[PDB]
Symmetry: C3
Subunit: 282 residues, 3 copies
């Protein structure tokens, strides 16, 4: 880990003295869900590039910003554009923001991402609540906590079985009723794989048999660092595609389609998140 | 990744100006299958050590060469001796040749390797066509594409479900009939593990339950880089041994036996490959 | 690997000329099992920090020592405090001692660790003999042998299916009868995960379905290096907790509880080990 405790502190303090805003809820917008930034009011934007110690983006979409503001009654901070392991970032960089949020005073982290559906029942457009995750990179060593533990943040061996807030998932199921939507609010296990290439059929079968419902290339690292911090954690996946499970099918998962789905069910996710803010304690 | 786009270009151009040969098909010979180099005509040999930017071998068998020539009607380029992750090479070195081949004008990659049989039906000497693969190292982060994507080679999120050419696998099943062999041409899923040590019984059971048919310590990285490039891909495994699946058995998988099998079914593989060249488009 | 063959030699020779002791059996004490050091006689202690080339501890418990002596008729060497991958150590450091032991003249390695129980039959306090292991980090590349192989230690592709000594496991089952204990001596498969955070429910389910009986964050690397060396290997896990397998349960795995169990069944393990020494050849 290239960051000392001081680096996290210096970054937090810089931010605190450059905005009057004091966030409680941190929101990490996944792929094609950065729209949420438009719904904040009293919005103050910061480019990642101007924030000391922040991972400087390579050349994905060149858009990397921290937006502070209010979202339906909650003092928020949103990450529009997140860091991925597949881009070459070591996990201690990918999750660097999460620890900054904590020192800013945040106590809740909402994570969203786009993911392939592994559960045969899921459909494009569906929203899946995350009850649990399978951290494959973590089993092998790619765990954001690897390295000396800093007592100031958390314990050496933090538990994850209770990572996804029970209370918030229920209130999420509740709130969805108010939406009175056509489809139900899905719920299941999220499995992380490093990517950046998509799964083969054999690989999809594996992920299925392991009990995963959706597959993505992010999130788990941030969740683990959050929990290690004491942050409350809630999140969901936008099923942008149904991974191929048979060899007969003549279709391929492509970024084009993912973004497309990200465009359709776009504001559908944003609403849910904005409303759910009221369901978050203080 | 220590290689810039320029490095790949400089290597390709050096090769292009040092041989009149212009390959279409690149062939990566696995363990004990380097014999194929003898069947090329108008053969021109290059030691890896003389090629700019090529990974310089440590001390496996000290034989590392690029052989250009013609194989049964096709302008080829063969790798006699390939790079492995278990030797300490980062995947961007292991797969460095594949991207060079692409800039040389190659459009097809044939990969062969030796592997343990996981499917109880397979037998030593058997040849298994590869219909799909399970990339375990990739799930955790060891994917040759990790790092910034260069648009010039391919897309950020390339698909792999259609990695192994459907057309060529059928023509391979076809051609094998002409061989009129005793045993049938096997076909299945290849699972990659990093090695260099062999699987325990419990591990073999795992690989079996994941749906793999053969286990090896290579290939998948080259395949992914090829596909990312647009290369057509065909390949197979020589089942040099039946991995131990029970604790009662009193035998151990050893390099001696693998090489031995590599010696027996030696020319049997070479023929198939040489003939199959005619089955490859242009 | 940052160590040349010379480094291992220099460390062994330094040790040999700083103690008259000449160990035959090396014992690696897991978490809360370092008590075994008290049972050695003619004991000579060495802090890891004073041993050339030894990984210098960060700040776990600040206790890192090599204790030479005699344990019930056997010339031993014990590691009180072992190195873990989750602390940031590359596997070639974690396993550096094992190769030193070999050059000191050791021919047997006994490994103990604390682990969560995955098999529903196991109970806290139980002792599980290790018949086999599933090396998940190894499948992805985190194998202590990665890098050039040194013929002087072992072969390039060492087998592991026979890693856990058949003879010693039987004599262990035998000896346990003499204990005439309430509970039986358990036996099963150990799965290694990198940690340092604990498994989620979904992850526990995975490990279960893979056929593991106990999960830990160590051991496998040392075992592989031992075997590669020719060392006889015997070991066991102290089931300090039953991993959560359902979402209803309202309990969390914590270091507190692990240490607690380490304190209870403490001397129960020590005895077994001390007695078992007599069961070890010469
Ligand atoms: O089927 C899938 N497999 C793996 N990742 C994704 C994704 C997510 N979307 C992104 C690529 O569009 C990538 O960052 C990944 O996290 C969507 N569908 C899938
Ligand atoms: O049972 C097996 N498990 C894993 N790899 C191999 C191999 C391949 N052969 C090589 C070792 O002889 C090694 O490079 C690996 O890629 C043969 N049999 C097996
Ligand atoms: O349930 C478990 N999962 C993973 N590791 C452990 C351990 C072992 N104990 C240590 C943490 O107390 C850690 O080093 C790990 O190796 C006990 N219980 C479990």
């Amino acid at each position: 880990n290239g960051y000392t405790y001081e680096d996290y502190k210096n970054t937090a303090e810089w931010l605190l003295s450059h905005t009057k805003h004091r966030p409680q809820v941190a929101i990490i917008c996944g792929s094609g869900l950065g729209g949420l930034t438009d719904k904040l009011t009293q919005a103050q934007i910061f480019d990642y590039s101007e924030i000391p110690n922040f991972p400087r983006s390579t050349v994905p979409g060149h858009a990397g910003r921290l937006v502070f503001g209010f979202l339906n009654g909650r003092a928020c901070v949103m990450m529009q554009g997140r860091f991925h392991m597949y881009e070459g970032y070591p996990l201690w960089k990918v999750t660097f923001p999460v620890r900054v949020f904590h020192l800013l005073g945040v106590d809740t982290l909402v994570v969203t991402n786009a993911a392939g559906g592994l559960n045969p029942k899921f459909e494009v457009g569906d929203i899946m609540l995350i009850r649990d995750h399978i951290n494959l990179p973590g089993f092998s060593g790619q765990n954001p906590l690897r390295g000396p533990n800093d007592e100031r943040f958390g314990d050496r061996f933090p538990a994850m079985s209770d990572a996804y807030d029970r209370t918030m998932r229920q209130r999420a199921l509740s709130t969805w009723k108010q939406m009175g939507e056509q489809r139900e609010l899905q719920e299941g296990t999220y499995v992380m794989v490093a990517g950046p290439s998509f799964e083969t059929v054999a690989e999809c079968r594996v992920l299925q048999k392991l009990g995963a419902d959706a597959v993505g290339m992010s999130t788990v690292p941030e969740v683990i660092v959050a929990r290690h911090c004491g942050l409350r954690v809630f999140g969901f996946s936008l099923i942008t595609n149904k991974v191929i499970m048979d060899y007969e099918s003549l279709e391929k998962a492509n970024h084009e389609e993912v973004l497309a789905a990200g465009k359709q069910a776009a504001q559908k996710l944003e609403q849910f998140v904005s409303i759910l803010m009221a369901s978050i304690p203080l």
